[PDB]
């Protein structure tokens with residue numbers, strides 16, 4: 296079994312789409328991620344998985360904090376932006392939550408403090424304790440089988 | 449910030465739906481989970497998150513293996529079954545992959561050997577190296593905001 300078969304399989308697990316944001320000495324950094332998960336209720340924990348070659352990795356290692364911005368159906372362009380897939384950057388509207396930069400109009404905003412780091416092969420798991428949450432009732436951007444998708448209404 | 453607000457926020461992250469299966473001395477055990485994630489390409493790693501009160505936790509601890517069965521759109525009843533939501537268990541059709549019981553007609557089947565265990569609050573993360581994969585081109589069962597859903601076609 297090859298890399299292609301593995302990736303194809305992994306893409307059969309449908310997800311939402313997030314942008315992970317953090318702040319390092321004034322500068323806001325973001326990265327598109329769907330490797331995100333709810334972890335624990337007591338205490339309130341979440342986890343994101345970041346590739347070893349992602350610039351975001353060292354950013355979070357330093358800041359020890361991140362926010363997860365769950366993207367609405369209307370935010371596909373943001374997903375592409377923070378995935379490095381547009382030739383031209385976009386001017387993103389940021390607001391603030393729990394001392395973290397968050398994306399305006401996100402489906403949901405979840406601010407976290409890093410409480411654990413676990414290397415796992417290719418990637419590092421950043422376990423975050425949630426300090427602040429903001430929610431809206433928007434429909435979600437989905438990702439499945441290598442494509443963007445929507446919920447059936 | 450309540451428990452309710454946290455759970456509501458977590459539900460804002462849409463996912464596919466899996467059944468985690470394992471075998472322990474003849475007996476097949478299954479558990480519905482959406483806290484699943486692709487972790488690493490080299491080596492090929494995956495992760496599932498199991499609640500400390502789940503019977504499945506000790507099952508995996510002992511067998512040191514699990515399969516992830518991604519559920520198709522037609523398998524909502526299976527999801528409810530393995531979530532302890534049916535009064536009487538249905539008779540599930542199992543087949544075999546990499547020495548693990550897997551669910552027939554699943555959207556995808558991914559067999560794993562446990563290579564790490566990480567407690568994280570409420571839950572334990574079982575990191576699994578993938579040995580075998582089977583994929584189909586079915587549409588996925590989705591879970592979002594506490595309800596089952598489908599992709600827009």
Ligand SMILES: Cc1cc2nc3c(=O)[nH]c(=O)nc-3n(C[C@H](O)[C@H](O)[C@H](O)COP(=O)(O)OP(=O)(O)OC[C@H]3O[C@@H](n4cnc5c(N)ncnc54)[C@H](O)[C@@H]3O)c2cc1C
Pocket residue numbers: 312323324325326327328329330331344345346348349350351352374376377378379380384385386387438
């Ligand atoms: C849907 C999908 C899911 C993905 N999931 C994951 C995953 O879970 N884990 C993982 O490691 N990778 C994931 N990726 C890949 C990842 O998003 C890209 O590899 C990303 O470009 C890597 O970011 P970086 O940290 O290396 O920095 P970069 O490659 O530079 O970051 C990407 C982009 O973010 C932009 N950006 C950063 N800050 C700002 C800002 N302040 N204002 C405007 N633009 C800004 C930059 O302009 C850049 O183009 C996913 C990609 C897709 C499309």
Ligand SMILES: Cc1cc2nc3c(=O)[nH]c(=O)nc-3n(C[C@H](O)[C@H](O)[C@H](O)COP(=O)(O)OP(=O)(O)OC[C@H]3O[C@@H](n4cnc5c(N)ncnc54)[C@H](O)[C@@H]3O)c2cc1C
Pocket residue numbers: 465476477478479480481482483484497498499501502503504505527529530531532533534537538539540591
């Ligand atoms: C969509 C959704 C996502 C979920 N995600 C997670 C998650 O990621 N992590 C988590 O810990 N919990 C999750 N749960 C909750 C979890 O599925 C239930 O709490 C589950 O009942 C706990 O299983 P158990 O191991 O404690 O054993 P049980 O409570 O006994 O297992 C559940 C059911 O599986 C059935 N079953 C087991 N083996 C077989 C078999 N061989 N043939 C037929 N039936 C069988 C049993 O009859 C039982 O009814 C989720 C639930 C839902 C609905």
